[PDB]
Amino acid sequence: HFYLETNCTIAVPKGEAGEMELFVSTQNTMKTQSFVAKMLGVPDNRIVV
Amino acid sequence: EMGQGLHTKMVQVASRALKIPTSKIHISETSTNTVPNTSPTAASASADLNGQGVYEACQTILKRLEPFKKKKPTGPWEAWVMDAYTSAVSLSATGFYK
Amino acid sequence: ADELVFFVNGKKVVEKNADPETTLLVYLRRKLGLCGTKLGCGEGGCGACTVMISKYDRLQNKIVHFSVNACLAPICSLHHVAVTTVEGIGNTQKLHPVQERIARSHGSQCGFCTPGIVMSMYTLLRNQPEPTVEEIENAFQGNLCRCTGYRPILQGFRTFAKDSPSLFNPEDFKPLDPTQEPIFPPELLRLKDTPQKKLRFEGERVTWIQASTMEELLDLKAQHPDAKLVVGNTEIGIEMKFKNMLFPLIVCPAWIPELNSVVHGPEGISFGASCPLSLVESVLAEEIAKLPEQKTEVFRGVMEQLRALAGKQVKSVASIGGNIITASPISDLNPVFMASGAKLTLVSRGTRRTVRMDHTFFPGYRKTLLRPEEILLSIEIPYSKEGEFFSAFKQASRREDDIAKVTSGMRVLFKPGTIEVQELSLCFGGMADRTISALKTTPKQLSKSWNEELLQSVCAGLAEELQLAPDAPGGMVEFRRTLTLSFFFKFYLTVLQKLGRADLEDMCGKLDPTFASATLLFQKDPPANVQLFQEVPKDQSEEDMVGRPLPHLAANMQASGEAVYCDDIPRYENELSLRLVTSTRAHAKITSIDTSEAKKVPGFVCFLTAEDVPNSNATGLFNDETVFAKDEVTCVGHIIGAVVADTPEHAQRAARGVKITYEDLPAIITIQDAINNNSFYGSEIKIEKGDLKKGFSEADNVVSGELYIGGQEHFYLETNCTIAVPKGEAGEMELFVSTQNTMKTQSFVAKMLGVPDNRIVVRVKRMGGGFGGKETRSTVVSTALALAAHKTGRPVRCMLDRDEDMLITGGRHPFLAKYKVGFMKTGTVVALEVAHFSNGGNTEDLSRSIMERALFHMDNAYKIPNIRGTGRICKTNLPSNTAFRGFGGPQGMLIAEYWMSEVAITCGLPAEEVRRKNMYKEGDLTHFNQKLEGFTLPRCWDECIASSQYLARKREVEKFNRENCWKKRGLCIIPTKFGISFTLPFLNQGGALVHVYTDGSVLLTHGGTEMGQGLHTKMVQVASRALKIPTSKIHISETSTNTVPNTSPTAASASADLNGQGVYEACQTILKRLEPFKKKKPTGPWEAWVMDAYTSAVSLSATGFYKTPNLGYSFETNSGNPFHYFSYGVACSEVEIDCLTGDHKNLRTDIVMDVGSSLNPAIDIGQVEGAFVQGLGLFTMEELHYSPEGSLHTRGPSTYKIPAFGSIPIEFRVSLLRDCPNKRAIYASKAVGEPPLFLASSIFFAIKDAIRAARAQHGDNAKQLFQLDSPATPEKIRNACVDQFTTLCVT
Amino acid sequence: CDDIPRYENELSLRLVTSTRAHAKITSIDTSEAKKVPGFVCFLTAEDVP
């Protein structure tokens, strides 16, 4: 693809109820959220992309 | 937005649907906590899908502002909005398309 | 020297460049990132910063533990010590029993004070695994909570002591295994061998020398008398932080053994000067229990003053020598040391002398006999001699920093086998700029016998010798004068009893039986509490949590310190700090601003002013306020500008470097000034019904009078804070704020910057308290911070220090009322005319709406045929007053109950009868013509009188009063009616947004903000019932303007009603979309329906909105409903006042509150108790004081006394009315936030009741309608108890 | 994404990838990595919650 900006992610943990906010260079916020949630073992409603 | 001008197109669509200048509409970002279960921005369908969704969200707003414009036909957009607000009318809406 | 080494939660900390000015609190938070420990006052008075310290005691070969205030502990004093913070004892994945119990017991509300309270309790358990109920309460003497009302906290921890449905189940509490506590750092046990070497630390401006030997100390003091001694720092910390005192060279001798010794001599016990007050307390305590009473008269006198002196955190590090040398006019220890002639050993390089404390020891204001190179070595507290008696007293309050607070030590020695005075020493504090002795009075008593003539003689002398000019600094001259005589009187009576115990009965006298209670010393009465609520139908699904006592959703995280509050959020690497610069003149023109000195401070960036606002400098709810003052300032506290610097320290210093020159202008401070100058906000407001002239004409009686009601500082544990993050694109900015009004915050920032609202995002996760103080006044900080962010392009942050917050943000509105009431001999009120005046401050803000609410409740619970009420909002040169839980209602109602009490007295009928007789009735119309439907007040009344056994107890009060001369009891029952809904119609709306993700989890958000009231918990409960899924699948993360727009502020107790409905609707829309899928898979699980909906392309997102119908009152036609419904409640409270000191005890309080069908009884009972205690404070403890020039003096917990653990009624009972659904609101519930607060007036009137009893025994003779303004502080109570001392007749 | 200012306590992450098309992972030695200044930790399959 050679997008000028390569893949990048900033993950900001909130320390509460598994909450986490991620700033990402992605075309798919839904899957990013789901995959992060499943990996951590927390509900989707705790992850915001 | 990945450079294809999607937000530009969505603001254009919203501006026509709402009958107001594009300068009064702003898109800041995309987040899972404002619009959930979204499809990836792909298949060249994003403007198609979201444009339609934006259109519906705007129609809902217009319908709620209906009574106020009918009363103040010439009055500016800001007047209808403030009147809707002080009349306790919701000025927030979701839009969806399949 | 150089490096500082200590441990934090078992982790070694090595600081190579420790700065003497760095406190443990800032180090933990900003350096280590451990933000569980909070800044609540930085004064040592709130305890939000409590942490535990552990160290190997050199002179004990043992490991010890104790708590301290992190805000006052210099890190340079912590070398080779081990610190334990809330994060160190446990977390949500594994809570420590202390964290678990306070959480499950509903003892955590906003949660800002929880970590500190957890550490106080935790430290207690480390020193005493099985504490008594009394030790548990004493553990929190230094911890303040503004939300809970304390009951839940003590009840939850009681389970640690060796001493219908329920709110929580202790049986499920995890057991405590002490062996599992954190190990003492092994290294500190090894480093325990190597000798302690002197250390030297050099900061940006200060140099710290940690002396290891007496030799090094005296040597330094000899070569540099300049060196400032610092031990506990509980005094120097205040001086440096709040008085801008800077000491370039400091020396801490805490390590020196000679200064920490405890020697038992033949004359007494000698304590090294650096001995902490906690050690002095424990040593004297041991002696008092083991030695004969006759030898511990002085020891017990010292224990008396130490008992209420601060808390454990302070007494652990505060040295006895520190108190002495500080030489404060109100020190409670020096008067005792003087009166007892304690010996002080002073040393210097090569010199050593001994002097007994007397009038000469304190030359002038804050000075002593000590030479610049001398240091206090030790002090010997004397054993009392046979025939020697001692007493110690202290004023029940404190208004000024270090003056006008009467404290005393009194001693007397009799000639063996007689009652003839051999020696008499009466020393006082708070009566001059230093501790003094009545040297002119006492000598004239030598040789005299202890009799009635001596009492007169002494009283006559003190009244003359301790004379206070009406001009005297500190005021309260009458009160202070009366206290000196009253205290001596207690001493006089006490000596009589003691002489009697020595068998001199037939010589001195026996003492009137009814006089005995006057000598009684402080006694901790065991607490008793009961909470009654209605169980939900047995039929209710176990997953349906509506009506169940579900603990606050964030309780666990708050007890663990993991819950994040605004300032806990990590700083960006490029983040800047802002400090506000405020006016020091009530009204003046700004002739110039000089920042030359500000620019010299390291890290300075810029000074923002009106010229810097890009668009409009006009802000405020009514656009009559300036972001930054231009040309003139209109109050002390008026924001002139803001300094931006790299750190908060640099911003504070830079701020002091902004020199402003003024030109005073005519100022209007008080309500009289406003009236005398026709200075008001808008026109007169009024409500009138019936015929007044006729009403009074038919009245058998007519009473007129006035009443002044003091204001109130919210004192939310977390002060105002804002973080502004600029995005660098199209004016976009995101702000994290501690506010109850995201909408106005967003609007003000936008207008100030000149960008549309759609560019500004305001996010509020939670507030550590709000109570109305953050409904609008928080924007004052937000706009300034947002401007800095815009100008610098960098994120900026600002959290106000307590003094700044109390000064700048205003508070409740002080009220002045002039009433005239006409009634019949039967007690039936026929006519009422009341004119109200409130002090609004320098901007309108919410003042008008507040006055409107007061007028809406000037009737309280009574039907008055002919009534007229008027109100004017005074425009003055004081910080703008705003909303405060009650919103004008408590003031309007207190006035009503005041003239109502006089009605009862005048008619000679029982107060309860007079009140019940005038009470409204189902279907009646109020003075503003609204119909009272579902009027439950009568039920609350009947239930409360019966349940509290009011009548029988009224008999006990009479009995107590006939058998007690200087102690009186009062018992009053007060009702209340509170209208629910914003007085401004359209503000009664709410919105919500719900999302159901494909995994079935739900993300909910609404316009309400969480400030400790458990709003999110209730909304999750509501949504769970509406959706038919467990609360566990629903989550609320925060409140945001970009998820729900145009939200009303979280206020008027209407947030649950509004947002609950909004949430309910959003959930219904979701259900409708899921219907097709569930009808196809009836038993199928929620997750299956959700995924089917998703793959069928059905929207799983929806907004919800609600508008309270049929509202809209008109003052012009006195028609239309301003409220959706009313809240009702009744409270019966009993008190026991001290007629000689003005102090009192809140004995018992019974409350019956109608909260409809409670959404959560745990949270609602929590709100009733919390609101009630805030009221208790408003009416009896809380008092703000301003200089005649309009400058607020009361700016911290040391001078502003809010309720403490020990302030609540010993026996506290709360009942939620059964079977009273309120169909109108979400799930038949009723708002609960504000209604309960006024019920605290029951204590006010119980006190007025007691005073009346006191006056009937010592005053004139008749039943006058004496004046009792609010707050009914010890001063007002004492002055009202007219007797021979207030009149000086005993003279 | 990467233009966003870093938090003062923000950390950096770098992925460790396979140099073989298909093979068994016999062992992993991080002894040298631990010597690098600033090293915090090495995440592997074992660390996924």
Ligand SMILES: Cc1cc2nc3c(=O)[nH]c(=O)nc-3n(C[C@H](O)[C@H](O)[C@H](O)COP(=O)(O)OP(=O)(O)OC[C@H]3O[C@@H](n4cnc5c(N)ncnc54)[C@H](O)[C@@H]3O)c2cc1C
């Ligand atoms: C929340 C709070 C509530 C309080 N309430 C009360 C109260 O109700 N009644 C009351 O009486 N006090 C009260 N205090 C005051 C307290 O007792 C003193 O601040 C403390 O005891 C002093 O000791 P320190 O070691 O902290 O002294 P520092 O603050 O370190 O020093 C105080 C001063 O004494 C000097 N000094 C210290 N040791 C020596 C020595 N050995 N030789 C010569 N000079 C020395 C120091 O230079 C300095 O000027 C309160 C304090 C707080 C923080």
Ligand SMILES: O=c1[nH]c(=O)c2[nH]c(=O)[nH]c2[nH]1
């Ligand atoms: O009628 C009210 N309006 C408000 O703005 C407010 N704020 C508050 O705390 N109570 C009330 N009541």
Ligand code: FES
């Ligand atoms: S912040 Fe330390 S006592 Fe309040």
Ligand code: FES
């Ligand atoms: S819950 Fe304790 S101060 Fe708020």
Ligand SMILES: [Ca+2]
């Ligand atoms: Ca305030």
Ligand SMILES: [Ca+2]
């Ligand atoms: Ca005001």
